[PDB]
Amino acid sequence: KGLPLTIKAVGGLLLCKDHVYHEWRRIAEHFQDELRGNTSETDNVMSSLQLSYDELPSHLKSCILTLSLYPEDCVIPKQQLVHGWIGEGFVMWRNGRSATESGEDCFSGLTNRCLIEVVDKTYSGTIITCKIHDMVRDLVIDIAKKDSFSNPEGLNCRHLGISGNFDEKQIKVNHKLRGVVSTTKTGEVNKLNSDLAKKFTDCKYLRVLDISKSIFDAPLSEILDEIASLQHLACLSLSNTHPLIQFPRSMEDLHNLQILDASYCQNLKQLQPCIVLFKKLLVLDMTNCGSLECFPKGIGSLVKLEVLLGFKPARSNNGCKLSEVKNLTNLRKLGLSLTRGDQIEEEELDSLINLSKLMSISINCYDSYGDDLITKIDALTPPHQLHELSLQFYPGKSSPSWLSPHKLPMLRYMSICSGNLVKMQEPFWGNENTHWRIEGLMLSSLSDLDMDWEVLQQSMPYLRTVTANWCPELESFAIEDVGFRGGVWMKT
């Protein structure tokens, strides 16, 4: 796979043979075990990569070491790695860089050493999926062949990663097990039985338990009923599991529980009132969980959290409103999703001006009902610091009447997905002296949106790329087709 170093090493290895078929065939099927002998220490590919390993800081050594836990060329999501690093404690923090941004700069510290390479990147420059070259991968495996981080054969392991379809193969699990991760190769689902998930709850010292693509036999309420035996558990991403309807009610003694993730699980009816009192939460992440009764009451009671996605603000005598969001002075990512008019309240419409450390807002008006929601959105004012916003289904026809450089000057990135939006209001331009200072713009699927191009270029002087791909009605932009396909307009 492309490296000239490994190719010249294999050439120097095969140069001292007799060119008969059998050693060539077995080197073709036993490959890694010879380049780690280095023809008994003469060419040393492993040294030339291990010297790049051996100048990391020690926490970055621990963070890069967990990528020996994945299959051959799987495309690893960033978010799962960052949550594992926050969970089992490879990341320390005191000076405000508390949870998410420390995972961000640890991940950027690894990708800036050219150890982890990216796969795809959004309009806003953020990274979602990453992979590694396989020589780095079996280097990290051979370093995990040391201290019992990842054995994966035999007894002594400190944490374990499950591949696909272990319903019948009976992975050995001892009582050490500081983590259990689920590694899938972008599309498979780990077929799991009940007894392995019962033996997961037998591990006394288990800090990371993320189950990302698995189908179980029984409902998860009685499977994970004995998680009271789990005491020092830090993370749970119960994303994308079939039998999950109600997470178990023995979740009162989990007093550590630094994050809690359950994304894209469409059947999550009740969230228990025990996710109020433990006050040491960092990330609560319910994105796109449709059937959900939209929260418990004391969300503003716990204060040390940073990410709150899929809020679903409740009705009058229901759940929780937007009033306690003023109490959450530490969050920096926030995700709203709105259904009808009585989701929000009148004097709570200024609930988003005192969030000092807020960075991004996502608004998901997917299952919108009436024009009362459209009239009541237009008073929700974001703070004057705001880095990214993504309104994405938005049943209104005009702009939301705060989308102006006066109400938010420091906006840099912005995307608009599907919508009933027809045109932008006059505050959206505001070109007497103020301008957007915006840099990345995305218009995904808009069949009613009409505006010009040079008016944008005289209203947005700091653009770099504008990615629009389904807008059959402009035909004035510089990209190849604003209609059916898409371009980026990467200017000079």
């Binding site: 972008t186 599309g187 498979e188 689902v189 693509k213 189908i215 036999d217 994303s239 994308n240 599991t241 079939h242 039998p243 894209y264 469409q266 059947n267 009816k269 796109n288 969980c289 449709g290 059937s291 999703s337 998901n364 997917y366 299952d367 009902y369 997905c417 599907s418 995904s444 699927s445 808009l446 069949s447 389904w470 059959p472 209609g483 059916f484 396909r485």
Partner: protein, 327 residues
Amino acid sequence: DKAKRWFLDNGSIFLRELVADCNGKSIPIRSFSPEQILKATNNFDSSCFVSQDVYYKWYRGEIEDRSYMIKRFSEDEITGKRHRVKEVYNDIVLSARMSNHSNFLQLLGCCLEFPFPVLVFEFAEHGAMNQRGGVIVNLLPWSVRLKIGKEIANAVTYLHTAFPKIIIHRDVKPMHVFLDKNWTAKLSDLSFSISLPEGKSRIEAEWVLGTFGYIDPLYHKTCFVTEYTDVYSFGICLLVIITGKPAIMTISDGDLQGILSLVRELCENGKLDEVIDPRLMKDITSGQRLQVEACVVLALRCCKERDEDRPKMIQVAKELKQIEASL
């Protein structure tokens, strides 16, 4: 009861192949109790029925302060064959994935304790479109017809172009288009479509199916799918939109009227003066005539005997847009 068995099996098939197709990153499906859609459709047996097909049946309905549209898969037809269960599940997955585009009929939720799942969609006050038009007690103005032709052209181009795997809905048909309050057309029923593999615009299927008179006889002979096999069916679609005659028609003799043969002979002999619809002749048709016949020349251009003479679907939708932008 046994409803748990329905649930724990149907959704496992469901989740496994939507992770296989979409990697989970998808749309907010809302679950249900049974009784909401049971009393919403009045226990499946009422006058709230919209329209049927082989596998499924479309009902209207009403859950608390919102009317919805409900799609059930009939038990006997899907249980007689035991191997074509997967067209149901990729119908639900493709209807989930196409819901972020405006010209489709968005999946709002699913209940999955039933035959196999039962789907729910947002409301459209005009029903499905008939062999001629509205299934309401009714007459459609012609600008509305040109607009909805443009819209389901956009939707078919969205299937062909938006992904590295080309979805080809071979059953493009006037029976699948719905119409809302604002007469915006919305396709549905992606159960019959297949995904081409990546990079290749041509593979062979191994059976041929779907509604006589929309076949692409190229595909009926050869049994391999290209995107032009969709273009021919779309051509007969907007033929039915204009003329208002069914694609299978009779005049007293064996029930045989090849409608596109009739339109091409009235083109070459009757000279385009008879395709303007005796329920629509009282329209002003001042400059509307020349663009009616521009649409007819376009539709006959996209139903020619060789696919090299047919335009690609992107082009067809572009020149439809030019036609309505002529005025």
